[PDB]
Every structure is written in structure tokens, then in C-alpha cells.
Amino acid sequence: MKQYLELMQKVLDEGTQKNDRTGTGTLSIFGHQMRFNLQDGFPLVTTKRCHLRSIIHELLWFLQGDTNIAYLHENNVTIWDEWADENGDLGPVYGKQWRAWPTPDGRHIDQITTVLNQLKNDPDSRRIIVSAWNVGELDKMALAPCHAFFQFYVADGKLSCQLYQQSCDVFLGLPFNIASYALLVHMMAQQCDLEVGDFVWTGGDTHLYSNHMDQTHLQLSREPRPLPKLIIKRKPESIFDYRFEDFEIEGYDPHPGIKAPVAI
Amino acid sequence: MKQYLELMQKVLDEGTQKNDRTGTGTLSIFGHQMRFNLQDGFPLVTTKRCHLRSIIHELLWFLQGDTNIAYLHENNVTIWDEWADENGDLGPVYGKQWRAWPTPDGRHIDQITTVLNQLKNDPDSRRIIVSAWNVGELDKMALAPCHAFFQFYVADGKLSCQLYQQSCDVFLGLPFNIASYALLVHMMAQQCDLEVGDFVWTGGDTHLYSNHMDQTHLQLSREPRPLPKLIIKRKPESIFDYRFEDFEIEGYDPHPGIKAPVAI
Ligand SMILES: C#CCN(Cc1ccc2[nH]c(N)nc(=O)c2c1)c1ccc(C(=O)N[C@@H](CCC(=O)O)C(=O)O)cc1
Ligand SMILES: C#CCN(Cc1ccc2[nH]c(N)nc(=O)c2c1)c1ccc(C(=O)N[C@@H](CCC(=O)O)C(=O)O)cc1
Structure with a gap:
């Protein structure tokens, strides 16, 4: 998108050369922010074809509080394969922290449920937050959450969301995450009878x-195309009842996909 | 400061009227980011006099893992009084989460020292993070932490830091927070023999x-003056051994102070 392509060019122009844990090397900058007005259309990148299938199942997988890639295989999404153990477990990552954050005294906190209730009963709240950064469980995760802290905000019937992504693979991961959270915002807005607002990425x-x-x-030399349109076919009885079939993207005409090796 | 004044003018121009848990009402925007190059000078607002005494002692208090106001009183700092209980306790807030985040298996993580170790042996890590947002203990805190997530970054021998402040009182709280973290950055940098880089506020x-x-x-009508200089007269053995007197602020010639009420 114009904002996304602009960020790519910035990394290339101002990035600092860094050696990473994988040994591949990286061009890096620290601190950036983009804003996507969801009214203007779904922020699915068009300068390269994105696969909405893996994006949607991952999000639904998170909402179920599932950390085993079994469900993702049932739907042919392999994006998490190389970090799962021999049994397909990733540890207490995203799904676990979102649905059942463990307290030191044995109890459990469902951040998604509390967020839903805050949006409905106390929309003006300044602490409508979901965090996957559970310090005392990081050592158990097969990987440290790269998008671990986000906040919801309501103003004039619109629902906005800001995501702070501490670590970000610009080419592979970013397009994925933008679409993923814009999706969650639409879902949330629907369950709480609100309009969609802005998606702020930090x-x-x-x-x-x-x-x-x-x-x-290659991607930088392509011209971005008008954004598609997200359509939700049916309104389920809760935020936890959505299915892949409920979503329909419309008017998505992207440039051909671009293959790129993943750094493991 | 230029950036600060521009932020203020921004919420006034694009802000929406909202209500809050107190009933005072606020003008508010969602999503903003500004950067401070710490080598240009120490970011202490000049368009009104600020209280260094209070800012320094609060930070030293956090670093010791203290959550009782006794220490602050011994040094005439009353910024936290309104929230302390009969015994001066605030509950497991900043100081406790920073120095001793409790895990489910009975351990406690000292985030400050772990970050110091990462800056020395793994400066290229993308997980150099400190969080005060302990979902499992939020209900024991006198207040929900408003500056609960920050990240360190190293490049070209310079230490940078980005703070994500979910809820920000722009008039009263922002000047304090900006100066507080800028000070933490100088202390961190001195302990790791690094130069200071940028402070990014989101x-x-x-x-x-x-x-x-x-x-x-009233403040917006004033011309920011030149930024003061921070002089550290000693290099303590650890990040935990700094004293109020080790710090010297030079060239701080601010406009007169401007009093305003705290929304409890
Ligand atoms: C972010 C994120 C999600 N993820 C999983 C993933 C990987 C590393 C992580 N690292 C961290 N720190 N946190 C994470 O949550 C995380 C998640 C993805 C993994 C691979 C592709 C990928 O290979 N995309 C290719 C091919 C996709 C396909 O199979 O069709 C592409 O062309 O886009 C995309 C997303
Ligand atoms: C942020 C922060 C720290 N704090 C404490 C504080 C207060 C409310 C909070 N609220 C929330 N949600 N989180 C916090 O962490 C938090 C912290 C401050 C409190 C008061 C002043 C204040 O009244 N400043 C006035 C008067 C100063 C004085 O003379 O004592 C001024 O003129 O500046 C500044 C900082």
C-alpha cells in the first residue's frame, strides 16, 4: 500500500546493518508508525498476492486459545510448522495468553472476553488492552511473540486499534499482521455494534x-491498487463462533505473488 | 519543546470529546509518535518549569522495586499520595513488576537486570523489553500502569528506547514521563558504555x-527555549546505585510554572 511501500524504501535507505540470531543479516530501523483508515477499505497488500486463507485461520486459531498447530494442518496452513515440537505444540504463545493468562495463584484471565465486555459496558476506557507478553512464560514459548501488545479505542461510534510490534519482518510478516488485526477489528466492531475506525501500526x-x-x-517497482472490501456473510452469536466461510474479500486484484525464503 | 507543543496543538485540532472514569472529560486522539535525539540535549520541557527533584526520585524509587511512598516522603515528593492506601502502599505497580515480575511456577523475573545483560551480551536481540502490564495482578494495583511497555535498541554504539504509553495525560503526565525515560536511557547507556541515541514516544x-x-x-503561546544538558558526575557499580546528587542539570532556564489540577 502507499504506506507499506514507503516503509520498505525507508528501511533500504536508512537501515543499519545488523547480524541476527539466524546469521542471515538484516537492514534495520527502530520506531515507525502507520495509520490505516479502515473505512477506505481492507488493508490487504496489492503489490504482491497475499493468501487470506492462512491469515484467517491463524486468527481463528488464536481466538480459540489453541497453541497446537493441529487445527492449522486440518486447514492446510503450514506457516507455524518449523517452530512446533514433535507433537505440534508451540508452548503458551498467542492463543494461550489471549484466552487464559495464568495468574500466580492458579486462576485464569480471558483478555478477549474482558475486552468484549469493556467495549460494551465501558467504551470510554483507556485500558482496553490485550497483551501476549507474559514475562514469566516466555521461556516456555517456542518463540517470543513478535506482535505482543495491542489496544482498542472507541470514539464517535468508531472502533480503532493500535498494535505495537516490537520485532518486525517487513517483507514476510508485516503484510500478514496488518491484515490479521484489521480482521479482528471488523469482527470486534460487529459483535459490539460499532463502526470500524483506524488501525494504527507501530x-x-x-x-x-x-x-x-x-x-x-521487485515489489517496490509495482504500483499499488485500490484496496479490497471485507464482507462478513453472517453475524455469529459471539466473537468465538466465526468460521472461514463467514468472510468474503471483494475487489482484490493484486500483482502476482512473490516467493521468498523464511529465516529460521 | 517543539515536538511536545506540536502534540498539544494536535489533540486540540483533531481531538474528540470523551468522558472518563472521573467525570472531568477529555479532548483526545488515538495514536501518535515523536522522537527525541538525546544528543541534542536533555528533553525537559522549557515552556513551563518542571520539578527535577520529583522526576529523579520517582525513577530511583522504581529501580529499587519499591511500591510504598515512604521513600518519596523522606524526600518531599508527593506526586503519588492520592493513590496510596493507609499504609502508603500502591500495590504491585512499576517498581515491583520491573524488578520482580512473579511467574506461575513461583519464580520472579528481574526485568531491569535481564535487560542490562542483554545490552551487554546480546545487543542485537529484538526482545529487549520491559513490561509493567501484568494482567494477572492488575486488580491488586492502586492504578493501572499508564506507561507499561518499553523497548531498548542498539545501533552504531548508541542506545535508543521506545515507550508505548497507552494512556497519556498530555499536560500533567507527559513532561514527567519524557524526562523520566530519557534519564533511564542515560543511566543504561553509562552502565553499558554506550552513547545515548533516540527516545521514541508512542x-x-x-x-x-x-x-x-x-x-x-497559555503554554502554547510560549517559545521553547534551548534544551538543558545532563551531567552525570559518577559511574556507580550498578544501575541500582545511583543517587540524586550524581545528577546535574545545566542550562535549564524555563518559562514560569503553570499550575493545574490532577484528575484523581
Ligand atoms: C507475522 C506472521 C505469521 N507467520 C508465523 C510466525 C513466524 C515467525 C514469528 N516470530 C515471532 N517472533 N512471532 C510470531 O508470531 C511469528 C509468527 C508467518 C510465517 C510465514 C509466512 C510466510 O512464509 N509467508 C509467505 C508464504 C505463505 C504461504 O505458505 O503461502 C508469503 O509469501 O507471504 C507468513 C506468516
Ligand atoms: C506520569 C507520571 C508521574 N505521576 C504519578 C502518576 C499519576 C497518575 C497516574 N495515572 C496512571 N493511569 N498511571 C500512572 O502511572 C500514574 C502516575 C505524576 C503525578 C502528578 C504530577 C503533578 O501533579 N504534576 C504537577 C504538580 C507537581 C508537584 O508540584 O508536586 C506539575 O505541575 O507538574 C506529575 C506526575
């Missing part, structure tokens, strides 16, 4: 991997 | 209380 260590230069240059 | 619900409007316009 980055920390925002990088571009060394073996992605070519693909980035 | 806000969620960024607001101005209704009864701060006249004071805001």
Missing part, C-alpha cells in the same frame, strides 16, 4: 532480511 | 483534560 525493530533484497526491489 | 489514548485547556493555550 513498529520497534523493523527490519528487512538480507535474502529479501531482490524481492523487495 | 501514545495510545493521548488526551488533554477539560480543566487544562486554559493552561494549555
